Design a protein around this nucleic acid. Structure first.
Lengths: 207, 103, 86, 125, 64, 201
RNA sequence: UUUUUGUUUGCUAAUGUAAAAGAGAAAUUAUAUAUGUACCGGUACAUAAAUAAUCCUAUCAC
RNA sequence: UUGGAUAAGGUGCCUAAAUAUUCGCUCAUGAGAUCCCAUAAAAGGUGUUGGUUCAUAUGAACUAGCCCUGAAAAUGGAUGGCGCUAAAGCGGAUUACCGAUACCAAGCCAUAAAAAGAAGAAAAAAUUUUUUUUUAGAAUCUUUUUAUGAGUAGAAAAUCGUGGGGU
RNA sequence: UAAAUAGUACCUGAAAUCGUUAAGAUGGAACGGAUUAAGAGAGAAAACAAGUAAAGAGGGGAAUAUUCUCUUCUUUAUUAAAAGAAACAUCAGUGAUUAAUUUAAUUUCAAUAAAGCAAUCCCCUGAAAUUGUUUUCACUUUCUCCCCGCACUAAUGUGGGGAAAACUGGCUUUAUUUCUUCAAUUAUUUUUUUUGCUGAGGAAUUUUAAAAUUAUUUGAAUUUUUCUUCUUAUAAUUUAAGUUGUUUCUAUACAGUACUUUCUUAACCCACUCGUCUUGAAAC
């Protein structure tokens, strides 16, 4: 579904309408009058097999591999946990700087790109979302610090939705482990962290 | 070593200003390595954090940040105008701001 | 009626076509004319310029005559000054 | 500066003070328009005690409502609460200052069962 | 509006009516500024007032 | 502008241009230290600048010259006063900017062992045509009553000797380090070699 | 002088920053030229001449 | 009020913006530096720059730019200050920028004018049934639209208070 | 004595003025306006959680002193939801930015590879013999040669005087414009990169109609078609018909170090005693 006024093809995506406002004279009504919204659209330099730099989380400066565009704007990323310690994380594009090197441009990685995709087509935003009952259970124990931290870690572990993400993380990491590792300098590149030395200039250097 | 940086350093100059008159809605910011309008245009739209310390704790922490945005360039020599959620106190003139790589 | 946002009558395509019923046809024609390839002009530039030889000749002669007139005026004023000097 | 909470925007705070009231004790801070001849404030010299204008008026859609987004109504006994039964979500109730503890408890309980909020609920107890 | 444009661009039979129907245009200042409002356009020094002939279009475009 | 402090060598610098640049840096909250202030140059003849300073000297408060313009004679103090005059020193921020500046004659103990910078926008060689007269602030101060010019020259030649020794030692160390590098560069892996010479290291 | 915990009756525990995020950088000098070396200011030879548009320093955990 | 863009004027620092670009002139042992404006003349110069007209690349005579003499006052002193001479001076030229309570877009107050007006269910959350908001109609009123807003002396309207009196 | 801070100046007990304690500021005024920041006081009436089940205290109403029902408070666990704020995205309005673009007009040029012309000669340009017309010489490069100074130069060359062709420059033909150029200005059109600010309103008989877009469908036209246009019908969308969505946080709290607010201090910019007569007042 789309519209291409002036030759554009903006692509429409269904959107719910939940904001409610009291109407002028008698009742109330849903404020939004629309059923579709044009979809996110991403930068030209966002491909699946590309390596980006996490920029804002607790993994700032870490390098990661794009995994999937989640049809909600946000994209899934894996700085393969087995080499980098960066889990399957759903991050948005504008908090990422994507480099110019594809992980699948290496001749020994390019072979397993199909299996990469066939492992990645099954992640979705609902899996990344945090479910209400485990959120409630985590907030319950808030009413000595190491104990509650460990409890939070273990309940996150036993979340059923986290388990499938961990399984995908594990299998994709095992798939990408040896082939990445046998390229020593690239493996160190991924394992390293991106800093901003005072010798380099942001508006001069390229991503 | 540790504590990665991934932001550009800036200095808070005065407000958006004329002689004998101030408009404390925009703050003038200087960039570490920008000296031209063309180069300053590169940073337009980036979030800028003014991080400063307080004498006593406020949320269990002694540090707080005022957020802002690089709105447009100022002059020909790579000075930018930034708009913050709250006006930057003139105590902060000459102080250091993070201008972050995101968005 | 209640005032709404005044839509940009130049970039908002729906309002522009509402204001100008001929605009969408004119724009489509312009786009079609733009969508022409490059081989035709590449092989016809010489044809279009060789027929302009007579135009170049005609435009050369007028400027030539204008410069001739300017030089003649210069010479005649110089001659007048030379005659007056003595 | 302007203060904006929710839809309510207060165009100016820090109520206007009378010119020279800061440095004269006989001059109370309550605003008075200065007539003068060479008066500074009247002439609107910059950097001196700007005068109130109609341009500061808050919008009429949200003029008289409190931060709880409803209009206040001052009551003196339980009898003046009757009109609130229809618009309990548009009006909050404030008990008048000269109401005793006898009647304050009655008004509080009546407003509670009427489902209308009370501003000075915990006064005189 | 296209008829109005035609009647204005060519001093058509309905010009006074269209012009009078049209509210006076309220223009923003020029994007790159004026030269000198004090001096004539035809003065050898930079200046602004007077008849610009065809040069009014570049000024309208940045005043619009 | 972004350093802890900037040490600048005032030798061969025009007084007003140097003061303007320094004042802007100080107002932007940058600490600077000006050394060798007695080698500052001034456009115009020495006699002309001496006349200007005599006119300044003739200027004191009639009632009580203690309150009058304190004239000062050290070239460092002269540069400091020029910067102050180029600065809003009667406000709190201006006072902070003024106190963020340190001026010396010669190069004392901390500043003779750190890098000295130069403002090419204020160098005499770049700002004065070679056929026009200029003055030396040290000699001007001596004619006005500083009487410490020669001692600064002695200290300067001593510092020159010790700096020459340090420079020779540093040159030897750099030569031996380059010799170490050119040989250890053959022991790294060839693809590392290619990257290094491709990017010019 | 070193280590740990902290500064979350007028008092008797106790905190402030005009500026950390690699805040990195010691030769001297001339500007119609300089600098090093070797001989006796001179001679000879090297070096430098977008000089910070550089160099040096960072991540390889256990 | 929020943004944008300018006027006058500026962009070496004070002071936001050019130690911008491009072409000439000027060295002042009291240079000069924005209308009003904060003085300067006759007369001179073998200072330098450019023109004009005469005499076998020299000698003259003019001319007009900047500079110099003419040019001396009383508290200490003022291109506003610092200072500036490969100008930060003078005369242009080309760009960019900064710069108003003025201009433009949008919101809101009021004033003026205008268009118009004396009767029925909407949504959401739970699970067909409940729950929560509203479900309006005051003519000096209600809804909406546009334009506009300095002000002494002076005038008017609407408001805000005080003692006392009926209701 | 109800009360003595109602003790005879005795109701209440303001301001000026002064004391005690605490906090803060303090380089020849002090106060102030505008904007924030830091502290210190206070605060929950929007600044989360309605209901639900149980047990404890109560209050009412109806039903013919016994049943049902409505509730308020307290505790338990038991679930929502909503509101604000940030980020991102979308749209619209209004700007800033950087790359372009169709078609025309205006003496444009500039190259490539094969011929040819002229030689102070050529595209030019200069100087001379009721307007045109014609004629003459004089116009260029050399890392070319000759003579003189013969090293004299700023010079890895040079000054003066002569010759030479013709690379250089110019012109004339043939083919090409991706080797290279196809500019600039104007008119006339179509886009594009990165981004700042703003979101009024909430439409019970115009947030309709249409306009655009998509998917089918009717015929026609024409620039001849993967945005070609015009209607024939249908159904949806929004680019129409002024901002909506997602996720987090506030927060699973009842008042704190957060949030709202007052006050006190700073800091940047600005700010002369008011009243009055007066043309003119900060006025010595």
């Amino acid at each position: 579904k789309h519209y291409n006024v002036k030759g554009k093809k903006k692509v429409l995506v269904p959107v719910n309408a939940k904001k409610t406002i009291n109407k002028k004279y008698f009742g109330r009504k849903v404020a939004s009058k629309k059923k579709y919204v044009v979809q996110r659209k991403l930068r030209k330099s966002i491909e699946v097999g590309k390596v980006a730099i996490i920029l804002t989380g607790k993994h700032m400066g870490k390098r990661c591999i794009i995994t999937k565009i989640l049809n909600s704007g946000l994209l899934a990323v894996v700085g393969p946990y087995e080499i980098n310690g960066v889990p399957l994380k759903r991050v948005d594009s504008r908090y990422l700087v994507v480099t110019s090197t594809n992980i699948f441009n290496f001749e020994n990685i390019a072979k397993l790109k199909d299996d990469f995709l066939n492992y990645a087509q099954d992640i979705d935003d609902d899996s990344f979302i945090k479910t209400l009952e485990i959120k409630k259970k985590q907030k319950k124990l808030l009413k000595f610090m190491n104990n509650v931290i460990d409890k939070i870690k273990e309940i996150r572990k036993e979340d059923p939705k986290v388990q499938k993400l961990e399984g995908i993380q594990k299998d994709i990491g095992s798939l990408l482990k040896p082939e990445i590792l046998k390229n020593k300098v690239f493996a160190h590149y991924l394992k390293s962290k991106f800093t901003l030395r005072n010798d380099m200039v942001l508006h001069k250097m390229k991503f | 070593l540790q504590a990665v940086r991934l932001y550009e350093k800036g200095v808070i100059l005065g407000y958006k200003r004329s002689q004998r008159n101030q408009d404390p809605n925009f703050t003038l910011i200087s960039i570490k390595n920008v000296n031209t309008k063309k180069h300053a245009q590169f940073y337009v739209g980036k979030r800028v954090a003014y991080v400063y310390r307080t004498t006593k704790h406020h949320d269990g922490v002694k540090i707080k940040c005022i957020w802002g945005k690089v709105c447009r360039t100022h002059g020909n020599s790579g000075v930018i105008r930034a708009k913050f959620k709250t006006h930057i106190p003139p105590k902060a003139f000459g102080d250091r701001v993070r201008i972050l790589m995101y968005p | 009626k209640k005032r709404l946002q005044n839509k940009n009558s130049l970039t908002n395509f729906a309002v522009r076509c509402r204001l100008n019923p001929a605009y969408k046809l004119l724009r489509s024609l312009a786009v079609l004319r733009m969508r022409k390839s490059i081989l035709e002009k590449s092989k016809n530039k010489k044809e279009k310029r060789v027929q302009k030889q007579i135009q170049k000749k005609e435009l050369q002669k007028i400027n030539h005559d204008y410069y001739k007139g300017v030089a003649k005026a210069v010479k005649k004023k110089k001659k007048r000054e030379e005659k007056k000097a003595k | 500066a302007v203060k904006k909470v929710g839809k309510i925007i207060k165009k100016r705070t820090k109520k206007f003070t009378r010119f020279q009231s800061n440095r004269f004790m006989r001059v109370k801070p309550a605003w008075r328009k200065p007539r003068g001849i060479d008066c500074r404030v009247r002439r609107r010299y910059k950097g001196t005690n700007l005068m109130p204008s109609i341009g500061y008026g808050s919008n009429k859609k949200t003029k008289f409502l409190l931060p709880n987004n409803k209009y206040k109504y001052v009551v003196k006994n339980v009898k003046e609460m009757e009109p609130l039964i229809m618009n309990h979500t548009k009006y909050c109730v404030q008990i008048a200052h000269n109401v005793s503890s006898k009647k304050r408890k009655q008004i509080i309980e009546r407003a509670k069962q009427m489902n209308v909020s009370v501003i000075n609920a915990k006064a005189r107890l | 509006i296209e008829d109005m444009v035609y009647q204005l661009y060519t001093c058509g039979p309905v010009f006074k009516k269209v012009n009078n129907f049209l509210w006076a245009f309220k223009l923003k200042p020029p994007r790159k500024g004026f030269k000198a409002k004090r001096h004539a356009f035809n003065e050898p020094r930079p200046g602004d007032w007077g008849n610009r002939e065809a040069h009014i279009n570049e000024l309208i475009n940045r005043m619009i | 502008m972004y350093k802890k402090e900037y040490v600048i060598d005032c030798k061969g610098h025009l007084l007003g241009r140097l003061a303007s640049l320094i004042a802007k840096e100080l107002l932007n909250g940058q600490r600077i230290v000006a050394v060798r202030c007695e080698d500052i140059n001034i456009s115009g003849s020495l006699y002309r600048n001496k006349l200007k300073y005599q006119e300044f000297l003739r200027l004191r408060t009639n009632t009580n010259p203690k309150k009058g313009p304190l004239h000062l004679r050290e070239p460092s103090k002269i540069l400091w006063r020029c910067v102050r005059g180029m600065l809003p020193h009667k406000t709190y921020k201006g006072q902070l900017a003024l106190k963020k500046l340190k001026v010396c004659v010669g190069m004392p103990y901390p500043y003779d062992k750190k890098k000295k910078y130069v403002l090419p926008s204020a160098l005499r060689a770049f700002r004065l045509k070679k056929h026009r007269r200029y003055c030396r602030l040290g000699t001007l101060s001596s004619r006005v009553g500083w009487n410490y010019d020669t001692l600064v020259k002695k200290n300067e030649v001593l510092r020159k000797q010790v700096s020459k020794a340090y420079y020779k030692k540093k040159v030897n160390n750099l030569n031996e380090k380059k010799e170490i590098k050119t040989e250890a560069l053959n022991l790294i892996n060839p693809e590392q070699r290619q990257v290094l010479e491709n990017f010019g290291y």
